[PDB]
Structures are given as structure tokens and as C-alpha cells.
Amino acid sequence: MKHDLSSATEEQRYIFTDFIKQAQLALKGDSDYEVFAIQGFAGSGKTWLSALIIDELLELGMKVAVTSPTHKAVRVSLNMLKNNGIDTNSPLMYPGTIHHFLNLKLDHGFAVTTKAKLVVNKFNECLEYVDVLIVDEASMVSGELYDHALKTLGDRCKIILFIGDSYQLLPVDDEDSSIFLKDDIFHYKLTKVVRQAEDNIIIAKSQELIKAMDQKTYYPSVNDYFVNITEDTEGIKLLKSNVELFELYFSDFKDKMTGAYTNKVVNQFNEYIRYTLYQETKFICDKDELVFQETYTDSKGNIIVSNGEIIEVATCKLTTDIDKFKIWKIVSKKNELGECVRFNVLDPSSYNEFNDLLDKYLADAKIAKGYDRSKAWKKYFKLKEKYAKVRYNFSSTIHKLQGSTYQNMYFDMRGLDYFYRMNRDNVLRLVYVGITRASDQVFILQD
């Protein structure tokens, strides 16, 4: 009576029944696999299926960790579970970030790595012990995170369930870390557009892009996939110029977001929108929403803000740090854990001085000998990761928009044809993710 499995597709019912059976088998160490993954495109009922699985796991009395990439995604997931009647306050459910469940911090190996690696945080005894570990965004599961999750099998969880989209966009460092190309994972696949989404203009467009992707047959230009939409059609609209875009954007009162492929165009959108709204010359102000471009750690390497987190500034003060640089002291608004996060951001006026000192620290480090090597390398890394790297939240690259949903999306597609000829499938994935960020209307600006 609560959830009607009869109105689910054949695939959804099979995946639900199969995984619940595997989870129960795992309680007795008799499961056929330990790592599972659900694949689904936009409009495939993936999120609803995950809530059905979570609710039944709790009903059976199992402890379930529901992990998300950021605190913002945790709150979104909790609201989604609440929308399905799930008691998110149940003592058997453990919502939180994937970094928090895995008890991870950053470390360069001082006891030396050019990129700090994720390692377990010693002196932490308040560890989470569950039966089912669910990771809800597969697009952010790096090789390091994946290896850490699997290391908890048999210790703090008994089976792992990944959830994501096979038509995702992976970072430039880790293309081969795709969980969906892994052969030791049992893969559940949702390959049908579920009801209530069978008549969505954007979903229908996204299926056309998927169709061209799985047969390797492509149009001469990425713009040919929108020859029918023109500026007649609803759901999706092709705009003629930047003027028409911002004329609609600044009049738009719905939940919206803009995006492009390259960082330079995304930066231009962010700076233009912010100044048009507030005419603010200060790098940080009381009304900013900041999206972290990388994980922010303290001096010891403990994760203070996870990568991709979206924070609203409560207070911000421009002062001077370590007798050298102009910085912004920021206090975030309260999160779902009742924690107000504090972080510092370097002011652009000190960028040149900072980079000049970092270059000197780096040069000093690789000339140092004896015991001075580690101390010099510790000095370079300490300054290198001292300050948080943030951007505004009016625009974003399509890569960083995965896992976020809006009502309206303003998608700048100019220049994509250049990259389309270099890698057709990659740009088709880019367009697919871009238009599916919106549930109501997509505004596209072409060449």
C-alpha cells in the first residue's frame, strides 16, 4: 500500500527484488557479489528505485549508510527520501557524506606525494558500522574513493551499491576509473523511460543523444541534434544572442542555473551576473553562494569542506594573513549537522605575491638535501593548500553540474562544434548532461 511495485517496470522490479535478496544473503556471507551498481539515464526512475530499496532495507532491520558527495547533496537526498515516506530519522539509517563515512582525510605522506592522497583518519573511534553502504553519485567516485569504499567490506559494511548514469562525464585525470566499466561489479541497468517522464521534451531529446551514442553514429555537427527545436518548441528553446539570454535570465524567477563547457565562458557568466545583480567590487560579500573547486583542508589535512560543496556566506571579513596576504575570513551558514564551517579565501590582489612565494618554496624544496627535504616539502604543500578555491554559483561547467537538478537551464553551446570533431561521444555526453540539468525549460545559445 505504501509503495506500488506493480506500476514499476520489469527492470525496476527485478533490480529491487534481486538486490534485496543479495543484501539478505550478505548478512549470512552468502551473497554472489559484494559490489553492485545501478545504471540509469535521465527519466529512468533510478532515484525512485533507490528510495524503494532503502525503505525495504530499513524495514528488514538492516543498517544502511546513504552517502552523498557533499552536504548539499545529503540534504537533497534526505528530502527525496522524505518525499517517499522514508523515516530518515530511523536509527538504522546513516545519512552523510561519503568522505565522512569512509573516515577520510588528505595527506602527502610525511612521516612525499605531489598530490595528497585520501587516507583513513587515525584517532577516530566514532566510526560507522552498517550492513549496506550506498553511494548515490557514481560520477564523483574517484579511484581513491572507490578503493577506500571496497576496503571497508567485511569491516564496516557487507555490500556496496553504487548509483549513477552510464552516460556520465568523468574527470580528465580518471577516465578509466568508471565504476560502470568495472568487471567485478554486478551491474543493474535501467534502459527504459519510466512513466511520468515519457512525455518530457528534454528527456525525449536526451534519448536521441543516447541513441546516437550507443551505435557510434553521429551527425556532422552537434547543432544538428536541435534542428527541430528552433525557438518555436517548448521545453527547449534556441536563443539568438547573449542579449536575449540575459533578458530572459534576469526576468526568470524560477530555480535556474547557467552553464558552459570551458572555464573561461563559465567565469564570464559568473562575473557578469554577480555584478549586474549587486554591482559588487568586493571579491566576497554577504550575499554570495560559493562552490568549492577543490577539497579544503586544515593544516593537518582534515577535510573542512568537500570538493563541490555549495556554501552560503553568513559573515565575511577582509583582513591580512601571515603578515603577507590579503584574505577573506568566511563563516558559512548552518548545515544539516549543526556545524558552521569557517574558511579563508585568498583575495585576487594577493594572487601574484602568493604565486611568487609558492614558486620560491617549490624551488627551495627540490634543492634541499638531508632532513631539510621533508620540512621544505611540508612548507610548499602547507602554503599551496592553505586557502580555499571558490567560485560563484551563477554559472558552472557541465562537468560539475552532474547530480544537480534545476527548473530552467541556460546552456551556452557556442564553440562545442570545435570540440565535437575531436571527440564526438564526449561532446554528446556533455550536451546530454547539460540539457538534463533542467526539468522545465532549457535555453540554448548556439553558433
Take residue 139 and report the three cell numbers written for it.
Answer: 560520477
**412 closest CA partner among 251, 211, 272, 288:** 272
**413 closest CA partner among 392, 433, 394:** 433
φ, ψ for residue 358 (rounded to 5)? -60, -40
Beta strand 395-397 with 303-305 is unpaired
Alpha carbons 384 and 362: distance in angstroms, whole number: 10
**CA-based radius of gyration for the chain:** 23
Resolution in angstroms comes to: 2.1
Q: Do 141 and 177 touch, CB atoms closer than 8 A? A: yes
SS3 118: strand
Q: CA 215 → CA 210, 211, 212, 218, 425, distances in Å?
A: 9, 7, 6, 9, 11
- Name the structure determination technique: X-ray
Q: Do 3 and 20 touch, CB atoms closer than 8 A? A: no
**Which residues lie across from 65 on neighbouring strands?**
94, 133
Same fold for the pair 5-190 and 289-391: no
Q: Do 286 and 416 touch, CB atoms closer than 8 A? A: no
Given phi > 0 = left and psi -120 to 50 = alpha, else beta, which region is 340?
A: beta
Q: Do 408 and 441 touch, CB atoms closer than 8 A? A: yes
CATH number of 5-190: 3.40.50.300
For helices 242-251 and 263-278, angle between their N-to-C axes, nearest 10 degrees: 50
Report how far Cα 394 is from the mean position of its chain's Cα atoms: 16
Burial per residue of 370-380, b for 16 or more beta-carbon CB atoms within 10 angstroms, e otherwise: eeeebebbebb
- Domain 289-391, what architecture? Roll (2.30)
Alpha carbons 297 and 106: distance in angstroms, whole number: 7
Q: What secondary structure letter does DSSP report for 333?
A: P
**322 closest CA partner among 299, 291, 301:** 299
